[PDB]
Amino acid sequence: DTGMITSYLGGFQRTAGTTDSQVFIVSPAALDRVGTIAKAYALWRPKHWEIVYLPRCSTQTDGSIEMGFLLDYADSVPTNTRTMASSTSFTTSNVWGGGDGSSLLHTSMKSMGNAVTSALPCDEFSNKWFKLSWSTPEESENAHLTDTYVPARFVVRSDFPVVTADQPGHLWLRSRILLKGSVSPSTNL
Amino acid sequence: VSRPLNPPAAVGSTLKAGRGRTAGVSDWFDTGMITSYLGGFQRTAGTTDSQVFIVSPAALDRVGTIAKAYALWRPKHWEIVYLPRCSTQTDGSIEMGFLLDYADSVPTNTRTMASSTSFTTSNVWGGGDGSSLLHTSMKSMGNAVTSALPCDEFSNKWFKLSWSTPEESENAHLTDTYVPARFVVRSDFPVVTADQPGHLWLRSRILLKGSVSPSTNL
Amino acid sequence: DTGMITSYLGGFQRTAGTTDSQVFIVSPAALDRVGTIAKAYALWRPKHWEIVYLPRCSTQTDGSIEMGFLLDYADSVPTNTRTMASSTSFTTSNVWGGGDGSSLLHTSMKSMGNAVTSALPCDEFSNKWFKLSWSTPEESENAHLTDTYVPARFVVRSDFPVVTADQPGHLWLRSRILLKGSVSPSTNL
Amino acid sequence: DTGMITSYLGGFQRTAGTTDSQVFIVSPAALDRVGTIAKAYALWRPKHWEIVYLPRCSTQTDGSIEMGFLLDYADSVPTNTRTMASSTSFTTSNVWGGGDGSSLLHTSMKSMGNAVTSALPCDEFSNKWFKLSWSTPEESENAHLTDTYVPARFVVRSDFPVVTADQPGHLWLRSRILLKGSVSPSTNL
Amino acid sequence: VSRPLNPPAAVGSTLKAGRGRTAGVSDWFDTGMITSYLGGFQRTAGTTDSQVFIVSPAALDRVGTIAKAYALWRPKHWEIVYLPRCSTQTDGSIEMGFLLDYADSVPTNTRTMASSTSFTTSNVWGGGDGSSLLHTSMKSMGNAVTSALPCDEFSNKWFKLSWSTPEESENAHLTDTYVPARFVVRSDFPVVTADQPGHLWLRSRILLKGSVSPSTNL
Amino acid sequence: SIEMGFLLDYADSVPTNTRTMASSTSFTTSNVWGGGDGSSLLHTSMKSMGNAVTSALPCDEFS
Ligand SMILES: [Ca+2]
Ligand SMILES: [Ca+2]
Ligand SMILES: [Ca+2]
Ligand SMILES: [Ca+2]
């Protein structure tokens, strides 16, 4: 058991003229510390996987951010807000809100207050062991196949198109996972 | 030790579905007060510009597919709540209301919009208190900016669930027979650059009645 | 439940190439008895899968044997001692020893003495059922897909590349599995 | 222990001009699933061996079926009904009856109702272990010898000659047996 | 005044015999301790000469036909009692015993006979007290000359009732599978003129199991 | 239909028609698909009833 670990997931990017839509595969692979530790193991299971958004913009900034999870790799990614609002653990807030979530990064408290978070319901995987993968899914790979080793996908969206591109905030991950099975990091793919 | 046998000429049965459910799904359903996303408040450059939302279960994303298994429906509550998400330096206001006759024209100015049913207006950064109304059955209060369709006019009517959108060629009088009403949102302040200062949330409750095969439901 | 059963897995083959390692798929398919019995069932679960190495050579034979498991079909096969050592249930020993393991073939006790064994940690599958397959994984089959019906792969390699090919010992498997769901043997693929 | 297993024993054939008389040796050998499983074992013991007849003909069809067991391989096969009626577990019914026995094929209930079944009293073998045999007894083999490895014989008869041959019903077997002793399927004869 | 009629398409039944009796006869039977005549003790001129009796229900005259209605049987008790009927001036003795393996050879002298199972011997005019054992379940006592087969070895076995006698061509090992044992009686005193100094009575008890048509029983 | 009965004198001839058969001892007759209720009489000591088709020899003459 790794315990709760905080990882920088990436920034919240807003490209001009189009509504942003970043998709993150739920895997330790890319995480600075977790990714490294995980490489020495063959299997893993998510116990807690919650993303907390922290703003870095001015209160004058317009727009909101929308977050949620997709549990079937075959399901398509939401293109509008109404659709996004039906996803798992949907959360939305002004692009400048969420500052109260700061403490969640070094604590284990439950998201509360004006915190902007979205947590993957991990009860779904309490009996499964996923094989740790370090490669990106092929374009040609059948969705049903990918779904077998991808717990879920995390989606981040912008509610409306901006004139000028910017990065309103940061996406942080609080995760706790179980690692099992011995393998050489170099042979772990 | 020995048992008699007396087969019938033929064997069969008589099925009559209808406990109060057909094919495993109730024949009657009440959603209760629910909350879902309606759409964003979009501001543009034309003055005439206004957004129109047809009152229909199709507006509910998840509830939509459920409704597809029923033949009739009735609006028990349909109220829109405006939630601002912008700087208090934002100029302009928002105007909302309902049109009860599909034939009536859509308002193009404030004077006219003000006469719509359950009309309500407010500066675009007002209505913050409305956020507490979401997911709850509480009643409007605070600076909450809301507009509720008086559903008492439909308490005896049963609308047929229609899944296709009204055509152009369709006579307004005909469309009016299956569309309870239209919700209209207008901006009084034309803007240079399009933006979305707030959002529109829907607090509704509908009744679904009558069993029907989803695929045959049109 | 089949109970414990001993099966001849094959011989330990030493050759001239270095990246020469034998790979066995964890499945009842090829087993003399277990294979026949399993044919009448649709699903299975490994409760115990342990390989015991037994010598058949002179005490003058140099070199050692290395065994271990790969839990992800996508992981690559170790090519040197350093990385083989990181496989699951890794074990190693000189090529002519391991006699204390012979009794493990009719007993159910645990590996002790100079016995050379490698037991797959089956607690990993305690909650799932695999569909019994009798065909060999296609060449073109996506590793991720093969992984879905292959519990694990067992790997055996030499550290001492030899001049003349030989067979220093035998690989014995003592397993115990659960079978579930009926199906006609001739229908079982 | 195999537990209760359902096997297709064969159809009930009626040849024209002569009263049918099919004889089945009580052995797992020919059973689709049991036969396969049993091949990996050397010994067996019948705990439950009951045949249930299921009709597939019209209520207009004439005649009845008669079933029973012969416990001594030397005893001759019944040629008429009165004689057949003295065999072990004698059962007889219209060729179109027995439809209520359907449920017995996936249950473990005792035959009841209008079910047409005949069960071998297995208490007789509670202390014996028979050697599994896959060959048919020689014509020349002494009956007393055959009797040593054949628990019993199941006999099916037609009560009267039909004009046109037909297959009025199916013969199903619910069996439960104990298997013991390890052997290679290929060397098991 | 009027009764409805609704005939079936056909009529029939399902028979399953087996209360614990088939065709009017029990499927299980215990004879209890019974007494019957086995044979006479015949003395002849050869030394090798000995009488052999195969343990089988066929040895029971009346019980025999009854057994024919059953498929299996088991010896629970099989004891022979010798009853002398001769002058006390008669020389010689009698030797009796059982052979448990049909392959084993028949004893031809005293030294060898003495090693048979449940061996017993006595002067030909001895054993008078044995007459009280007949028809009763009493246990051997007095000078009673008896020999009892230890039936504990058959307590788990069920023999198939065979009515034909073993052939010559039959391999002893095969015969042994359906013959519980052989009882042997020998004279140690070869005589000039054949005579019969005593008789052999059988005190037995057997179990019969399994229904079968007597005529098909072989 | 079916007709059954007993002949008490081995000398008497066997009936060849219905009129004659009807006079046999414990005579009884019925359509060939009748008598279904009789199946309950088997293995029991119950007495004939229902549409049961039976014929019993008056054994009092042999007492
Ligand atoms: Ca891997
Ligand atoms: Ca419709
Ligand atoms: Ca299969
Ligand atoms: Ca065999």
Ligand SMILES: [Ca+2]
């Ligand atoms: Ca017999």
